[PDB]
Amino acid sequence: QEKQDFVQHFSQIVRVLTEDEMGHPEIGDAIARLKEVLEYNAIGGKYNRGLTVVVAFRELVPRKQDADSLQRAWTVGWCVELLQAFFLVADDIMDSSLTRRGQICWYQKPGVGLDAINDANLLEACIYRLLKLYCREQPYYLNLIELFLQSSYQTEIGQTLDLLTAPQNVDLVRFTEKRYKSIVKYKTAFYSFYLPIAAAMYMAGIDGEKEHANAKKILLEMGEFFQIQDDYLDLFGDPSVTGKIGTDIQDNKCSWLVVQCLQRATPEQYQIKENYGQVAVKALYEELDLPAVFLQYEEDSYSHIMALIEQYAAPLPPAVFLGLARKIYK
Amino acid sequence: QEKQDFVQHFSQIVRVLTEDEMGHPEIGDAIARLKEVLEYNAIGGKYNRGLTVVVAFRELVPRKQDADSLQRAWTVGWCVELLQAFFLVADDIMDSSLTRRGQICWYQKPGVGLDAINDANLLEACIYRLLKLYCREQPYYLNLIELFLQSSYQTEIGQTLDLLTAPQNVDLVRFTEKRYKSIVKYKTAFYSFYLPIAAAMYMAGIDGEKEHANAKKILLEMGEFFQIQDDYLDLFGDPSVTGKIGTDIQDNKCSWLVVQCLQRATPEQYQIKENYGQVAVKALYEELDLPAVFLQYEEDSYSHIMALIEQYAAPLPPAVFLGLARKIYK
Ligand SMILES: O=C(Nc1cccc(C2=NCCN2)c1)c1ccc(-c2ccc(C(=O)Nc3cccc(C4=NCCN4)c3)cc2)cc1
Ligand SMILES: O=C(Nc1cccc(C2=NCCN2)c1)c1ccc(-c2ccc(C(=O)Nc3cccc(C4=NCCN4)c3)cc2)cc1
Numbered sequence A, B: 001q002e003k004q005d006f007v008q009h010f011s012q013i014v015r016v017l018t019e020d021e022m023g024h025p026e027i028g029d030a031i032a033r034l035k036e037v038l039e040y041n042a043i044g045g046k047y048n049r050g051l052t053v054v055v056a057f058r059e060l061v062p063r064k065q066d067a068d069s070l071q072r073a074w075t076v077g078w079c080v081e082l083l084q085a086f087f088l089v090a091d092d093i094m095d096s097s098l099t100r101r102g103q104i105c106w107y108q109k110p111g112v113g114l115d116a117i118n119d120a121n122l123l124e125a126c127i128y129r130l131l132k133l134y135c136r137e138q139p140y141y142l143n144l145i146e147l148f149l150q151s152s153y154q155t156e157i158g159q160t161l162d163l164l165t166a167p168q169n170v171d172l173v174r175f176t177e178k179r180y181k182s183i184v185k186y187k188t189a190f191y192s193f194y195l196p197i198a199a200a201m202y203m204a205g206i207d208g209e210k211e212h213a214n215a216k217k218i219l220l221e222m223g224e225f226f227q228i229q230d231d232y233l234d235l236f237g238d239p240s241v242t243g244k245i246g247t248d249i250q251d252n253k254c255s256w257l258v259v260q261c262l263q264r265a266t267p268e269q270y271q272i273k274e275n276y277g278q279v280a281v282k283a284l285y286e287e288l289d290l291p292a293v294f295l296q297y298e299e300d301s302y303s304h305i306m307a308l309i310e311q312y313a314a315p316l317p318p319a320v321f322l323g324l325a326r327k328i329y330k
Helices: A002-008 A010-017 A025-041 A048-060 A067-094 A113-135 A141-165 A177-203 A209-236 A256-262 A282-287 A290-312 A318-328 B002-008 B010-017 B025-041 B048-060 B067-094 B113-135 B141-165 B177-203 B209-236 B256-262 B282-287 B290-312 B318-328
Strands: none
Touching (some): A002 A048, A010 A067, A025 A067, A048 A318, A067 A141, A067 B113, A113 A141, A113 B113, A113 B141, A141 B141, A177 A209, A209 A318, A256 A290, B002 B067, B010 B067, B067 B177, B177 B209, B209 B256, B256 B282, B282 B290
């Protein structure tokens, strides 16, 4: 039910971002185009990240939430969604993707193409316009600005690392465990899991370095499991349950699965760079019982995350972290 | 001589941006690549914008400049240069350019291609890393963050507007004066002329809304002349004096020259969308005495800028604005 109140707030988000027309009509055409970029690219996902901001926030304070406070929590939720849209529009260009969210990628639209690059940059910019519009008088204004800038930088560094690692031709010597973890941490975990809780945290007046560092320990480990599950499901999931079918192996992805395969292949199995990149790695993954290795790692990972929450949650409510965990773990 | 002290400070800029290796070796390869992006893309221009920050700054205070203060002025100079590099790397992709600064465009490098998009984003991100590293304890920290974010947004809006206006096929009904001015203002004038002085301004403790608004009036008008001269010189300049030869007409640019041509062409001359986009518009421009129209507009524009400085400079030293004007006007 909540997610809907969050999705409701978008037309106001868009309204507010397309107001300058009023004060500066000369730029009207550019603003109309920005509105298209918003509506194409910010809508249509699951909104778990932006929603995480609202749930966290509302779990992290009880009587300090008048209508304006909740409004800011929604806006900063949507800022996370804009950050994500900025990455995705740009990542889709970089990897020559065709579809996104069951839709043609913004850039594959006739009349868009590589103009999508500036479109992506505008999505980014809209983050800091919303923060100024809604949060500039707030004590946590600067903390949120720096948080979104740091998240972007980490993500971009992760993406660099990913591009160096899986060039758009087989090479498996790069696909190591330490490199995999490192890509997941910077490219996915920081912005997907730390950013949304940390922002809620700052908005609740919880600005301590120690507390953020504790929350981060928990959340980066959750992020890591998330992506690994993601990788497992890409291949071994049911498209009837998941809502897409996966192309990791074809794409020369540094998947958890291929990293696991490599540290557990006799040289015969090793090569086999003869089937990585288009059909069945899939058969070899099953020969090495990677589904059982996953099942086992998931059990250990859950144990590990529960101890992490035990050790590192306080003085925050465990529920904030437990909520995420329940979602991650079927 | 100064410009050299500014260019000297780069290897420290790069050193400082590539330090995280020390604390986080897992990301080493990504950092090495970032260092390449810096050195390819931030070096090789004229550095007028970043240099404008140092000259302004040093003209705007007399005994309040110890070694650390001058260091910050240099760093924020270089932040402007990084902003510029971010735009240029990205603009070069969007318009399928071949060369930049007498060099192959970063993205045309074999092994780079559309990865340049993330490279561009990293240049952007490095702005706010330098500001944090050097300026976070300064009273003007937040003002500079917001200034660089606003400059980026304006520029991106300008670029949108430019893309809507000169799609990569002839149409001349879009090439109006009001649209031209509007593109120059947002795409070029804000970040090239207002940003560098305003940052120097903030660093000197001059944070007044009124003063910034006055400085802006002067500087956006300087920006406008700059670009118009740029357009004139593109065609009618001497490549032996300028250091490049111009391709505006071929590229379907909204040049000042074509805007002037259109409001002064009988329908015969009008069409003539038969020669706009590849050889000689050039002959028709001379038939309409556009070089004399330029010469005249330049004389009026100089008059106008001197009155603007007279009226709007105080309480800042006229020299800060006069220095720029002297450079703009042969
Ligand atoms: O509202 C839900 N969770 C929620 C949202 C916001 C905050 C919280 C929360 N709990 C307390 C603290 N915050 C929980 C919720 C509803 C449906 C789901 C649901 C959505 C997608 C899936 C699913 O597709 N999982 C999955 C697997 C692999 C990848 C992804 C995925 N999602 C984003 C990009 N990739 C997602 C599973 C469950 C998840 C969460
Ligand atoms: O150091 C010089 N000017 C300067 C630099 C920084 C601050 C100031 C300044 N005066 C007091 C306040 N700030 C003046 C300087 C040295 C050589 C030049 C020079 C460089 C290029 C040109 C020239 O190519 N002009 C020109 C024409 C059209 C375009 C461009 C251009 N430059 C950046 C992108 N396009 C440049 C003319 C003169 C300009 C300035």
